[PDB]
Amino acid sequence: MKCLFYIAGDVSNYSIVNYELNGQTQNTFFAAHALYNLFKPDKVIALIPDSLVKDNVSDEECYKNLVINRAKELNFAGMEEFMNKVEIRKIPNVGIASAIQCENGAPKKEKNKEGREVLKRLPYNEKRSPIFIFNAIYAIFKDEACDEYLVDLTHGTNVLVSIGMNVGALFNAKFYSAPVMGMPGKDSIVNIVELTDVVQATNDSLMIRSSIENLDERYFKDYSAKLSRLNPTIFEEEEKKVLTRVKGTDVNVVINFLWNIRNGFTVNAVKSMNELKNIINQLEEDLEKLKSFYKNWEEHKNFQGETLLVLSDLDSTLKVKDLLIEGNDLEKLNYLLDLYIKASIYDKALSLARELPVAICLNKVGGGMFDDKNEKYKHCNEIVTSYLRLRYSGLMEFRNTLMHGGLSTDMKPNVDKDGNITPGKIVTKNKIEDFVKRELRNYFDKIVNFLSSA
Amino acid sequence: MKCLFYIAGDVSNYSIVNYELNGQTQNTFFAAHALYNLFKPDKVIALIPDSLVKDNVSDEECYKNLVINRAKELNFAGMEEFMNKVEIRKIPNVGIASAIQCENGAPKKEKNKEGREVLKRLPYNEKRSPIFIFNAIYAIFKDEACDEYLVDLTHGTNVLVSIGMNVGALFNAKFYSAPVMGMPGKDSIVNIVELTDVVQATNDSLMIRSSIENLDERYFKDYSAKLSRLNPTIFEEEEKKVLTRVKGTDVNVVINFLWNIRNGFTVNAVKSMNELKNIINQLEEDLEKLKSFYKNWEEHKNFQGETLLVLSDLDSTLKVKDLLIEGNDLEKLNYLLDLYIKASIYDKALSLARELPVAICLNKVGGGMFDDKNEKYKHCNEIVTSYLRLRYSGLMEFRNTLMHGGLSTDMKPNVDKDGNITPGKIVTKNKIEDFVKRELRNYFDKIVNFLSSA
C-alpha cells in the first residue's frame, strides 16, 4: 500500500498552476494533489509544523479548513473528497517564524491598517534540536505501517526539508519537490523534480567507500547497468569521446578483486592489482575530464537532463587505488597482509602471515610449487612451522582457532545429552584484536628477517 | 584547511539581526558571515546559483557587488576580511525563477508605479535533472581540496538545499541552517541549527541495518557513548523511567554477537542468542514508549533540546531480531548456518556445515567434548569425515580451500626465482557462490538425515 507524505508550508499565498512529470500534468493549485492524482496513494499524511497554525481547539481541523478556504477563494474543482482521506500530523519546528492564529475551527481575520490580513504578529520563537524534529517525524513515518513511501518536500523550511529527507531515506522513499521560486500567477506550468536518485547516489558512494575500507564486495553497488543504458539523445564529439570511455569501465574487475580479498584468494587478487592499476588510471583521466566538464557546466548543457551519469559513483570507485601497490607478487601479498590488518579481518591476516614466509623462503631457493611433493616447499614449510612453533607459538594457536571456529577441537566445546553446548575456551576478543593489530606485523617482519639469511 | 560552503540566495531582503551558537554571538544579516567569524575558515565558497543573478561579462562579481551594496546601505562595520577574500562558483538550478539582472557590478534599479527595487527577469525555462545539479556541486566540492568541510544550507531552494546536503554528506561536512520563515525584523536574536547529527543518524542507521544483513559488526555504529552521556535536566518521572531503561540497553552484546558470528565463534554466538532475545524484547517496549512520546511530542518538550537520543539508532538495532531463533544450541547453530549462506560468508558456512553434523552425532550418543581424547567424538568425526569423503566429496574440498586460501597446499600456486606467483587449481567466484548458495544446504540436510539413524 502506497503512502504520500507532504510538508504543509502555507496555502494562503500560492495559486493555480500546471504541475507536470513524465509528460503528464494535473489541473491543481497545491503540489500534494498533483502527485496524489498521478500516483493514487492509499494514505495521505499532512505535516503541520507547531509554528504555522494554532487553533487551541484542533490545529488538525484548522489546516483542514485553511485549505478548503483557499479552494473557495479561487473556486476550485474537487479538493473536498481529497480532504476527507488526508490524515493530518503535527510536526515540530525551530527558529523565529510567521505563526498564524486560529479562533475555533477557522483562521481569524485582522483588518490591520490598509489591506486584509490574518493573525501573524511576532507569533513564534523556539530553540529545538533538529534530532528532536527528526525523531518526531521518524515516529510518524514508522507508525503509518506503509509499504511504499512517497515524500513531497515542495513546502517547508530548508531545515524541515533536509530533516524530512533523512527520515524518508530510512523508509526507501521516492522524494519529490516543485521548485516554486516566487509565483507565476495563472497559466504557468511547473515541473516536479524527483530527488530519489540524488539520495541513492550518496548512499551508494558511502557504501562503495566502505567496500574498499573493509575489503568487502557485498557493500559495492554495481552501477554497471546504470552505465550500460546511459546514452543521451544529444552529444558533442568531446563528450561522446569521454562517455564511451566511462560507459566501458570494468567495474566487475573491482568487484572481483574485493571478492578474492574477502574470501582469501590472495594469489589471484595479487595478480589482478596490475589490471586494476590500469582500470583506475583510465578512470582517473575519465573523471578529471568529467570534472572540468561539470566545473564548466554552462558550456556543456547536454548532460542538463541526463540522470544515469553520476560522478560520486565513479569518484568513490577511485578509492580502490588505496588497495593497490607496485612490485613482485610477493611484495604485493606483503601489502595485502597489512590491508587485512587495517580492516579487522583477523583470520585471513593470520593465514597470510603464516604462509607468506614459506613463499618468501621458496623464492630464495629458486622457486617451487606449494605442494608436499615439492622438496623445496617440504623443507621451507618445516623451517617456517618449526621456527614458528619455537618462537611465535601464539601466532599458530590463533590462526588455528580462527580457521576452525568455535565448533572445533581447537575450542573443545562440550555437547550434552539434551542438545546444549558449553564452550571449553574463552573467546579472547581483545587478545585477537590486540595480537593482530599490534604484535603480528612485528612478528612477521622478525620471521622474514630470519629467513633472509637462509 | 577549513572551507565554509554556502548558498548566497538573495541578500537584498536580509535584515541586520544577531546570531548565536555554542555561547558565541556574531551579528550579520546572512548566516554565512556569522559562521565565518566564529569558525575562521581558510577558504569561503559562495556557490552562486545560475537563476538569481544574470550579468553579461562575468556575473560572479555581480553578486560580489550585490553583497557589498547591501553592506554599505545599513553601514556595516565588518565585511573587510570576508569580501575580496571570498571565492564564488556558478551552480545550476531547476524549475521557474529568474531575478536580478546586472551591468558591470551593482544591480539595475526600476521605478514602475511606486518604489525603487531591482527589476527581476520573469521567464525561466530550465528543465534539468537534479543529478546534473548534484554532479556540478560535487565537482566544486571535490576540487576545493579541503580537509574540513562546513556547509551553510540556510539559504537556497528546498531542491538545492537537499542536493547540497547529499553532496556535503560525501565530504564529512558539518551542516548549518538559520531558520527564518517570514520577516524577523532588524536586531533579532536568531540561533543557527546544526544538521550534522541528523545526517549522521541516517548513515549510522543504514550501516547498522547492513551490519545485521551481512553479519559484520564492523558496520555497527556503537551509540553506547551517545547513550551514556544522555542526561537531560528537567524530565518527568515517566520520561526518567523510560530514559533510564534505554540508557542501559546492552548494545555491546549486539556488537559482540556480530563479532562472534563474523569471526566464526559459532558456539558463543548461539549461546548469547537468548540474552539478546531479552535485550531486544526490552528495547521493543522502550522504543514503543519512546514512539508514543515523540508522537505526542508537545507533552515531552524536555527532549526538544536533547541531541544524544536518536530513535533511528535504536529502531535499526531491533533488526538484530532477524538473527535470532529459539531452541537447543544445535537448532540455533542450524539457523546460523543458513544466515552464513544468506550473507555471502562462504568460509564460515562450510566449516559450520562440516562440524555441525559431528555435534549432532555427539548429541545422539549422549554427549561429549570436541577433543581427540573423547571416544564418542573420535568416531563421530570419522563417520562424518568418511560419509562426506564418500558421498559429498565437493563440500570437504571447498571447505579446505577457503580455510587455507589461495597461497597454500590446497591451491598449489607456484613461486618463481623472480618472485612472480601463478595460481594453480584456480577456483571461480561462481563455483563457490553457486555451490554454497544453491547445493550446500540440501547436502547438509542429507548428511543430518543420515546421522539421525546413528
CB atoms within 10 A of CB B338: 15
Contact A429, B272 (CB under 8 A): no
Burial of A393 (C-beta count, 10 Å sphere; 0-12/13-18/19+): exposed
Q: Identify the helix (H) or strand (E) that includes residue A367.
A: strand A367-369
Return the C-alpha cell found at B379.
Answer: 568416531
Bridge partners of residue B208, in order along the sequence: none
State the Cα torsion B141-B180-A44-B167 to the nearest 10°. 0
Residue A290, SS3 per DSSP: helix
Q: Identify the helix (H) or strand (E) that includes residue B4.
A: strand B2-6
- Give the span between the Cα atoms of B161 and A193, in whole angstroms: 13
Closest by CA position to B46, among listed B37, B33, B57, B29: B33
Contact B199, A202 (CB under 8 A): no
Contact B161, B20 (CB under 8 A): no
Determine the longest span between alpha carbons in chain B, in angstroms: 105
Q: Which 8-state DSSP code applies to residue B86?
A: -
Contact B218, A344 (CB under 8 A): yes
Contact A356, A380 (CB under 8 A): no
A191: which chain B residues are within 8 Å (Cβ-Cβ)? 94-95, 127
State the Cα torsion B368-B372-B373-B378 to the nearest 10°. 60
Return the C-alpha cell found at B361.
Answer: 552425532
Closest by CA position to B11, among listed B65, B47, B91, B87: B65
Burial of A268 (C-beta count, 10 Å sphere; 0-12/13-18/19+): buried
What are the strands, taking DSSP E only, across B79-119?
Answer: 90-91, 100-102
Least Cα separation, residue A18 to chain B (angstroms): 12
- Do strands A193-194 and A173-177 pair parallel, antiparallel, or not at all (unpaired)? antiparallel
Out of A155, A297, A412, name the one closest to residue B370 (CB).
A412
- Do strands B24-26 and B18-21 pair parallel, antiparallel, or not at all (unpaired)? antiparallel
User: Among the residues of B296-415, which ranges form H helices?
Assistant: 311-317, 329-342, 346-364, 375-391, 393-404
Q: Which residues of A290-320 are buried (b: 16+ CB within 10 A; e: fewer)?
A: bbebbbebeebebbbebbbbbbbbbbbbbbb
For this entry, resolution in Å reads 2.9
- Give the span between the Cα atoms of B406 and A352, in whole angstroms: 9
Question: Positive or negative CA dihedral for A322, A323, A327, A333?
Answer: positive
- Give the span between the Cα atoms of B346 and B344, in whole angstroms: 6
Q: Which 8-state DSSP code applies to residue B109?
A: P
Residue B47, SS3 per DSSP: coil
DSSP letters for A112-174: -SSS--BS-SS-------HHHHHHHHHHHHHHT--SEEEEE-SSS-HHHHHHHHHHHHTTTEE
Q: Identify the helix (H) or strand (E) that includes residue A84.
A: helix A81-85
B134: which chain A residues are within 8 Å (Cβ-Cβ)? 198, 201, 310-312
- Give the span between the Cα atoms of A12 and A15, in whole angstroms: 8
Closest CA in chain A for residue B166 = A202
Question: Positive or negative CA dihedral for A79, A83, A84, A86?
Answer: positive
Residue A251, SS3 per DSSP: helix
- Give the span between the Cα atoms of B42 and A399, in whole angstroms: 49
Contact B23, B38 (CB under 8 A): no
A50: which chain B residues are within 8 Å (Cβ-Cβ)? 298
- Give the span between the Cα atoms of A177 and A151, in whole angstroms: 9
Planar angle of CA A291, A295, A296, nearest 5 degrees: 120
Query: Chains A, B: CB contacts under 8 A, how many?
Result: 461
Inspect the interface and report whether the beta carbons of A355 and B135 lie closer than 8 Å: no
- Give the span between the Cα atoms of B119 and B104, in whole angstroms: 16
Return the C-alpha cell found at B438.
Answer: 544453491
User: Among B54, B160, B186, B198, which would you mutate to test the A interface (most chain A Cβ atoms within 10 Å of its Cβ)?
Assistant: B198
- Report phi then psi at A415, rounded to 5: -85, 125
Out of A95, A169, A178, name the one closest to residue B179 (CB).
A95
State the Cα torsion A287-A288-A290-A295 to the nearest 10°. 140
Out of A135, A181, A210, name the one closest to residue B96 (CB).
A181
Q: Inter-axis angle of helices A375-390 and A393-404, to 10 degrees?
A: 110
Return the C-alpha cell found at B383.
Answer: 563417520
User: Among B294, B352, B431, B433, which would you mutate to test the A interface (most chain A Cβ atoms within 10 Å of its Cβ)?
Assistant: B294
- Report phi then psi at A129, rounded to 5: -95, 135
Planar angle of CA A150, A154, A157, nearest 5 degrees: 115
Q: At a CB cut-off of 8 Å and minimum separation 6, what does A341 contact?
A: A349, A436, A437, A440, A441
Return the C-alpha cell found at B407.
Answer: 597461497
Contact B181, A98 (CB under 8 A): yes
Out of B142, B218, B266, name the one closest to residue A407 (CB).
B266
User: Among B132, B190, B196, B235, which would you mutate to test the A interface (most chain A Cβ atoms within 10 Å of its Cβ)?
Assistant: B132
Contact A329, B421 (CB under 8 A): yes
- Give the span between the Cα atoms of B64 and A135, in whole angstroms: 40
Bridge partners of residue B101, in order along the sequence: B54
Bridge partners of residue A3, in order along the sequence: A43, A149
Residue A435, SS3 per DSSP: helix
DSSP letters for B230-297: ---SS--HHHHHHHHHHHT--HHHHHHHHHHHHHT-HHHHHHTHHHHHHHHHHHHHHHHHHHHHHHTT
- Do strands B414-416 and A367-369 pair parallel, antiparallel, or not at all (unpaired)? antiparallel
Least Cα separation, residue A301 to chain B (angstroms): 9
Give me the long-range contacts of A234-242 (CB less than 8 A, separation at least 24): A234/A302, A235/A302, A236/A300, A236/A302, A239/A293, A239/A300, A239/A302, A239/A303, A242/A286, A242/A289, A242/A290, A242/A293
- Give the span between the Cα atoms of B102 and A104, in whole angstroms: 49
CATH superfamily of the domain spanning B2-197: SSO1389-like (3.40.50.10640)
CB atoms within 10 A of CB A182: 12
- Give the span between the Cα atoms of A359 and B407, in whole angstroms: 8
Contact A119, A108 (CB under 8 A): yes
Q: Which residues of B261-279 are buried (b: 16+ CB within 10 A; e: fewer)?
A: bbbbbbbbbbbbbeebeeb
Out of A92, A180, A362, name the one closest to residue B415 (CB).
A362
Ramachandran area for residue A359 (φ above 0: left; ψ -120 to 50: alpha; else beta): alpha
Closest by CA position to B351, among listed B378, B367, B333: B333
- Give the span between the Cα atoms of B84 and B111, in whole angstroms: 31
Q: Identify the helix (H) or strand (E) that includes residue B77.
A: none
Q: How far is CA B211 from CA A218, A370, B110, B260, in A?
A: 11, 36, 60, 13
- Give the span between the Cα atoms of B443 and B361, in whole angstroms: 16
B63, HSE (Cβ side, Cα atoms, 13 Å): 24
Contact A46, A88 (CB under 8 A): yes
Q: Which residues of B298-332 are buried (b: 16+ CB within 10 A; e: fewer)?
A: eebebbbebebbbbbbbbbbbbbeebbbeeebbeb
User: Among A20, A87, A96, which would you mutate to test the B interface (most chain B Cβ atoms within 10 Å of its Cβ)?
Assistant: A96
Contact B108, B101 (CB under 8 A): yes
Q: At a CB cut-off of 8 Å and minimum separation 6, what does A112 contact?
A: none
Inspect the interface and report whether the beta carbons of B420 and A328 lie closer than 8 Å: yes
Q: At a CB cut-off of 8 Å and minimum separation 6, what does A400 contact?
A: A410
Closest by CA position to B154, among listed B1, B11, B24: B11
What are the strands, taking DSSP E only, across B130-228?
Answer: 148-152, 173-177, 189-191, 193-194
Bridge partners of residue B174, in order along the sequence: B150
Distance of CA A47 to the CA centre of its chain: 26
Inspect the interface and report whether the beta carbons of B129 and A306 lie closer than 8 Å: yes
- Report phi then psi at A88, rounded to 5: -120, 115
B195: which chain A residues are within 8 Å (Cβ-Cβ)? 130, 159, 162-163
Q: At a CB cut-off of 8 Å and minimum separation 6, what does B212 contact?
A: B220, B258, B319, B320, B322, B323
* Method for structure elucidation: X-ray
- Give the span between the Cα atoms of A416 and B364, in whole angstroms: 9
- Give the span between the Cα atoms of A32 and A14, in whole angstroms: 13
B379: which chain A residues are within 8 Å (Cβ-Cβ)? none
Q: Inter-axis angle of helices B130-143 and B158-169, to 10 degrees?
A: 50
Question: Positive or negative CA dihedral for A436, A441, A446, A451?
Answer: positive
Bridge partners of residue A422, in order along the sequence: A414
B391, HSE (Cβ side, Cα atoms, 13 Å): 12
Inspect the interface and report whether the beta carbons of B194 and A130 lie closer than 8 Å: yes
Closest by CA position to A301, among listed A309, A293, A289, A292: A293
- Give the span between the Cα atoms of A192 and A180, in whole angstroms: 10
- Give the span between the Cα atoms of A325 and A323, in whole angstroms: 7
- Give the span between the Cα atoms of A193 and B92, in whole angstroms: 14
Distance of CA B27 to the CA centre of its chain: 34
Inspect the interface and report whether the beta carbons of B198 and A93 lie closer than 8 Å: no
